[PDB]
Design an enzyme around this catalytic site. Structure first.
Site, PDB file in Angstrom:
ATOM      1  N   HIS A 190     -52.872 -19.823  91.231  1.00 38.92           N
ATOM      2  CA  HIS A 190     -53.221 -20.134  89.846  1.00 38.92           C
ATOM      3  C   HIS A 190     -54.707 -20.385  89.591  1.00 38.92           C
ATOM      4  O   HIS A 190     -55.102 -21.470  89.189  1.00 38.92           O
ATOM      5  CB  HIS A 190     -52.366 -21.334  89.404  1.00 38.92           C
ATOM      6  CG  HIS A 190     -52.197 -21.503  87.930  1.00 38.92           C
ATOM      7  ND1 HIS A 190     -53.107 -22.214  87.188  1.00 38.92           N
ATOM      8  CD2 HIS A 190     -51.167 -21.140  87.133  1.00 38.92           C
ATOM      9  CE1 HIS A 190     -52.643 -22.213  85.952  1.00 38.92           C
ATOM     10  NE2 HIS A 190     -51.474 -21.590  85.872  1.00 38.92           N
ATOM     11  N   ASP A 242     -48.783 -27.062  87.699  1.00 34.95           N
ATOM     12  CA  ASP A 242     -50.091 -27.388  87.110  1.00 34.95           C
ATOM     13  C   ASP A 242     -50.107 -28.884  86.965  1.00 34.95           C
ATOM     14  O   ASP A 242     -49.066 -29.477  86.589  1.00 34.95           O
ATOM     15  CB  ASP A 242     -50.267 -26.769  85.744  1.00 34.95           C
ATOM     16  CG  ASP A 242     -50.503 -25.300  85.739  1.00 34.95           C
ATOM     17  OD1 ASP A 242     -50.592 -24.710  86.840  1.00 34.95           O
ATOM     18  OD2 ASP A 242     -50.690 -24.746  84.647  1.00 34.95           O
ATOM     19  N   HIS A 285     -50.374 -33.375  83.011  1.00 34.42           N
ATOM     20  CA  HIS A 285     -50.585 -32.038  82.421  1.00 34.42           C
ATOM     21  C   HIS A 285     -49.844 -31.841  81.086  1.00 34.42           C
ATOM     22  O   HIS A 285     -50.493 -31.883  80.040  1.00 34.42           O
ATOM     23  CB  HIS A 285     -50.248 -30.960  83.457  1.00 34.42           C
ATOM     24  CG  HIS A 285     -50.523 -29.561  83.013  1.00 34.42           C
ATOM     25  ND1 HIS A 285     -51.821 -29.064  82.958  1.00 34.42           N
ATOM     26  CD2 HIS A 285     -49.657 -28.576  82.677  1.00 34.42           C
ATOM     27  CE1 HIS A 285     -51.702 -27.805  82.573  1.00 34.42           C
ATOM     28  NE2 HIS A 285     -50.421 -27.467  82.383  1.00 34.42           N
ATOM     29  N   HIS A 294     -45.341 -20.054  83.360  1.00 39.76           N
ATOM     30  CA  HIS A 294     -44.524 -20.619  84.428  1.00 39.76           C
ATOM     31  C   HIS A 294     -43.019 -20.441  84.144  1.00 39.76           C
ATOM     32  O   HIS A 294     -42.231 -20.470  85.089  1.00 39.76           O
ATOM     33  CB  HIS A 294     -44.885 -22.102  84.736  1.00 39.76           C
ATOM     34  CG  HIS A 294     -46.343 -22.317  85.036  1.00 39.76           C
ATOM     35  ND1 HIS A 294     -46.822 -22.387  86.354  1.00 39.76           N
ATOM     36  CD2 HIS A 294     -47.388 -22.462  84.186  1.00 39.76           C
ATOM     37  CE1 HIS A 294     -48.133 -22.550  86.249  1.00 39.76           C
ATOM     38  NE2 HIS A 294     -48.522 -22.590  84.969  1.00 39.76           N
ATOM     39  N   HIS A 301     -56.160 -29.792  83.796  1.00 37.98           N
ATOM     40  CA  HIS A 301     -56.037 -29.320  85.171  1.00 37.98           C
ATOM     41  C   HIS A 301     -56.967 -30.177  85.998  1.00 37.98           C
ATOM     42  O   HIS A 301     -57.961 -30.652  85.454  1.00 37.98           O
ATOM     43  CB  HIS A 301     -56.460 -27.847  85.299  1.00 37.98           C
ATOM     44  CG  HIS A 301     -55.562 -26.877  84.618  1.00 37.98           C
ATOM     45  ND1 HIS A 301     -54.270 -26.680  85.038  1.00 37.98           N
ATOM     46  CD2 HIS A 301     -55.830 -26.012  83.613  1.00 37.98           C
ATOM     47  CE1 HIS A 301     -53.794 -25.705  84.283  1.00 37.98           C
ATOM     48  NE2 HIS A 301     -54.698 -25.279  83.409  1.00 37.98           N
ATOM     49  N   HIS A 355     -44.750 -24.454  80.244  1.00 36.07           N
ATOM     50  CA  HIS A 355     -45.753 -23.456  79.880  1.00 36.07           C
ATOM     51  C   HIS A 355     -45.300 -22.019  80.150  1.00 36.07           C
ATOM     52  O   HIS A 355     -44.673 -21.718  81.180  1.00 36.07           O
ATOM     53  CB  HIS A 355     -47.101 -23.750  80.539  1.00 36.07           C
ATOM     54  CG  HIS A 355     -48.008 -24.636  79.729  1.00 36.07           C
ATOM     55  ND1 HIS A 355     -49.055 -25.310  80.315  1.00 36.07           N
ATOM     56  CD2 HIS A 355     -48.019 -24.887  78.393  1.00 36.07           C
ATOM     57  CE1 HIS A 355     -49.664 -25.945  79.330  1.00 36.07           C
ATOM     58  NE2 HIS A 355     -49.087 -25.704  78.154  1.00 36.07           N
TER      59      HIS A 355
HETATM   60  C1  LIG Z   1     -45.374  -9.956  77.332  1.00 34.68           C
HETATM   61  N1  LIG Z   1     -46.361 -10.377  76.310  1.00 34.68           N
HETATM   62  C2  LIG Z   1     -45.710 -10.608  74.994  1.00 34.68           C
HETATM   63  C3  LIG Z   1     -46.768 -10.882  73.896  1.00 34.68           C
HETATM   64  N2  LIG Z   1     -47.618 -12.008  74.337  1.00 34.68           N
HETATM   65  C4  LIG Z   1     -48.361 -12.669  73.230  1.00 34.68           C
HETATM   66  C5  LIG Z   1     -48.211 -14.201  73.381  1.00 34.68           C
HETATM   67  O1  LIG Z   1     -49.169 -14.498  74.401  1.00 34.68           O
HETATM   68  C6  LIG Z   1     -49.401 -15.835  74.700  1.00 34.68           C
HETATM   69  C7  LIG Z   1     -48.765 -16.402  75.818  1.00 34.68           C
HETATM   70 CL1  LIG Z   1     -47.623 -15.439  76.711  1.00 34.68          CL
HETATM   71  C8  LIG Z   1     -49.028 -17.716  76.214  1.00 34.68           C
HETATM   72  C9  LIG Z   1     -49.987 -18.465  75.514  1.00 34.68           C
HETATM   73  C10 LIG Z   1     -50.190 -19.913  75.918  1.00 34.68           C
HETATM   74  O2  LIG Z   1     -49.683 -20.240  76.978  1.00 34.68           O
HETATM   75  N3  LIG Z   1     -50.864 -20.774  75.109  1.00 34.68           N
HETATM   76  C11 LIG Z   1     -51.046 -22.209  75.340  1.00 34.68           C
HETATM   77  C12 LIG Z   1     -52.392 -22.582  76.026  1.00 34.68           C
HETATM   78  C13 LIG Z   1     -53.650 -22.287  75.190  1.00 34.68           C
HETATM   79  C14 LIG Z   1     -54.390 -21.111  75.439  1.00 34.68           C
HETATM   80  C15 LIG Z   1     -55.564 -20.836  74.711  1.00 34.68           C
HETATM   81  C16 LIG Z   1     -55.997 -21.747  73.726  1.00 34.68           C
HETATM   82  C17 LIG Z   1     -55.270 -22.930  73.484  1.00 34.68           C
HETATM   83  C18 LIG Z   1     -54.111 -23.213  74.228  1.00 34.68           C
HETATM   84  C19 LIG Z   1     -50.831 -22.950  74.044  1.00 34.68           C
HETATM   85  O3  LIG Z   1     -50.922 -22.221  72.921  1.00 34.68           O
HETATM   86  O4  LIG Z   1     -50.604 -24.147  74.054  1.00 34.68           O
HETATM   87  C20 LIG Z   1     -50.622 -17.895  74.369  1.00 34.68           C
HETATM   88  O5  LIG Z   1     -51.545 -18.608  73.613  1.00 34.68           O
HETATM   89  C21 LIG Z   1     -50.371 -16.562  73.993  1.00 34.68           C
HETATM   90 CL2  LIG Z   1     -51.210 -15.785  72.643  1.00 34.68          CL
HETATM   91  C22 LIG Z   1     -48.323 -11.772  75.632  1.00 34.68           C
HETATM   92  C23 LIG Z   1     -47.268 -11.484  76.738  1.00 34.68           C
HETATM   93 ZN   LIG Z   2     -49.706 -25.345  82.382  1.00 32.11          ZN
HETATM   94 ZN   LIG Z   3     -50.387 -22.489  84.169  1.00 28.01          ZN
END
Ligand SMILES: CN1CCN(CCOc2c(Cl)cc(C(=O)N[C@@H](Cc3ccccc3)C(=O)O)c(O)c2Cl)CC1
Ligand SMILES: [Zn+2]
Ligand SMILES: [Zn+2]
Length: 451
Positions: free
Chosen positions: A410, A171, A150, A68, A388, A65
């Site tokens: 976290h 996690d 997870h 992390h 989680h 993830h």
């Molecule tokens: C330095 N900057 C650069 C520009 N970025 C843009 C990218 O940002 C992110 C980041 Cl870093 C992580 C996630 C993520 O971990 N997502 C999971 C869990 C999830 C969440 C919600 C709903 C469903 C799932 C998934 O998609 O599996 C994400 O979604 C976005 Cl939009 C920010 C940091």
């Molecule tokens: Zn996670």
């Molecule tokens: Zn996490």
């Protein structure tokens, strides 16, 4: 009596940029190296300015993830860090493609960007792989890992330095889903426990109820002539959702007219890599993979981009990213938000500073990437599949291990306080058991004296 130091550079009284510094007997250890999705540039990083990268002996990564391992290519390539890095095999394999989708989805030029796809590719050789239930010794530090459940390849690291045992959960989930195992309860007892607090003040409903609610919402959207948006990155909890939907479409012949798209430029590669690590999955899905592979979807089609999409009639699109900051899921949300028949389903833990978090505060309007304003008419639902541990699973984990010291990381600041209070109450009237619970802020240190 040697002094043990634990300091969160990230994930201290927050969710995002997990990075924890562990200092004991002339050894410096870093646990995780993530970015913060709700922040930009250098601020999205953990407080790395408070340490010397060259002094870090060991760097351990719990799971793939972004919160992390997202900062990992910057820490490996753009700092004086000369230590060793460890991941499980599935984590390293997935890390390479999730981060590639992340750099793609990102909305800035090389100037403002923390790292590139070349930095990510080059960082790979600097990462060693570890198997589960296998001891490795680095600079006197002995370590091994357990299953965290997870996500695929997620580990809980046990670290032993001169008779002092520390367990970091990363996690974790203590329930099996369709393809993942539950987290293991180690039989070896740690002196220190560093545990996630994400859903620690809540209680999970049955898997059957969460799956039914999810499927009923999707079905309700398409029935009313709408299109369903399910934002998710190509690798993570998306794999569980694809399994649920594909089964539901099989059980409902009246939906064979409605297409399901798994939209990512890397969709084929992501699924092929995922399936390479079937050895790290449930006993159920491991035995059935050579009978009928459920990862070979009967009702889901891949979709490279908006250009390859005929947005004609009701459909269901699973698109990156999960928090809808930019990319395909943001593009589709902007094209669909004004029609009340359409609907968005948020399945993950939304972090402050993201569109996904914002749209749940029921706004009247939203801002586009171009800068324009649009009315929010489409339905917005939150059905968590974040995997989680709840209060019963956190409590049960702490009760089986009974560690003298419990360190919370976290989690949202106020819910972490509530979790701490409940854990303290659980052992207040107990004379035979003694547990100290800590909840440090970012940059704050937990100091413990041993022997
Ligand atoms: C330095 N900057 C650069 C520009 N970025 C843009 C990218 O940002 C992110 C980041 Cl870093 C992580 C996630 C993520 O971990 N997502 C999971 C869990 C999830 C969440 C919600 C709903 C469903 C799932 C998934 O998609 O599996 C994400 O979604 C976005 Cl939009 C920010 C940091
Ligand atoms: Zn996670
Ligand atoms: Zn996490």
């Amino acid at each position: 009596s040697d002094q043990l130091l634990i300091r969160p550079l990230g994930a201290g009284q927050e969710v995002g940029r997990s990075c924890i510094i562990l200092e004991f007997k002339g050894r410096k250890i870093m646990l995780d190296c993530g970015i913060h999705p709700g922040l930009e540039g250098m601020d999205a990083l953990p407080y790395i300015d408070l340490i010397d990268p060259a002094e870090i002996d060991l760097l351990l990564i719990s799971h793939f993830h972004l919160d992390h391992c997202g900062a990992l290519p910057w820490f490996l390539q753009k700092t004086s860090f000369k230590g060793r890095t460890f991941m499980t095999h599935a984590t390293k394999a997935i890390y390479r493609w999730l981060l590639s989708d992340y750099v793609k989805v990102s909305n800035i030029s090389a100037d403002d960007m923390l790292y590139t796809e070349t930095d990510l590719e080059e960082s790979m050789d600097k990462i060693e792989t570890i198997n589960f239930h296998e001891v490795k010794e680095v600079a006197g530090i002995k370590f091994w890992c357990y299953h965290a459940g997870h996500v695929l390849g997620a580990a809980m690291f046990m670290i032993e330095i001169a008779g002092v045992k520390l367990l970091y959960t990363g996690d974790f989930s203590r329930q099996e889903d369709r393809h993942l195992m539950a987290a293991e309860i180690p039989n070896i007892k740690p002196d220190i426990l560093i545990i996630e607090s994400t859903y620690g003040t809540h209680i999970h409903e049955k898997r059957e109820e969460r799956e039914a609610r999810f499927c009923n919402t999707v079905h309700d959207i398409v029935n009313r002539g709408g299109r369903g948006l399910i934002p998710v990155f190509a690798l993570g909890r998306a794999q569980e959702l694809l399994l649920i939907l594909d089964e539901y479409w099989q059980n409902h012949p009246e939906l064979h007219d409605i297409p399901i798209y798994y939209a990512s430029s890397l969709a084929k590669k992501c699924m092929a890599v995922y399936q390479t690590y079937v050895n790290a999955m449930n006993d159920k899905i491991r035995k059935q993979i050579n009978i009928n592979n459920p990862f070979v979807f009967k009702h889901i089609s891949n979709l490279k981009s908006m250009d390859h999409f005929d947005d004609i009639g009701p459909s269901v699109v699973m698109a990156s990213p999960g928090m809808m900051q930019s990319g395909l899921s943001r593009e589709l949300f902007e094209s669909w938000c004004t029609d009340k028949r359409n609907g968005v389903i948020i399945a993950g833990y939304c972090v402050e500073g993201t569109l996904a978090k914002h749209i749940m505060s029921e706004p009247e309007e939203i801002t586009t990437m171009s800068g324009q304003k649009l009315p929010l008419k489409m339905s917005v639902d939150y059905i968590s599949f974040s995997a989680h541990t709840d209060y019963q699973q956190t409590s049960e984990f702490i009760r089986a291990l009974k560690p003298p010291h419990v360190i919370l990381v976290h989690g949202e600041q106020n819910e972490m306080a509530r979790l701490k209070a409940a854990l303290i109450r659980e052992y207040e009237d107990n004379d035979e058991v003694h547990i100290e619970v800590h909840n440090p802020r970012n940059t704050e240190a937990v100091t413990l004296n041993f022997r």
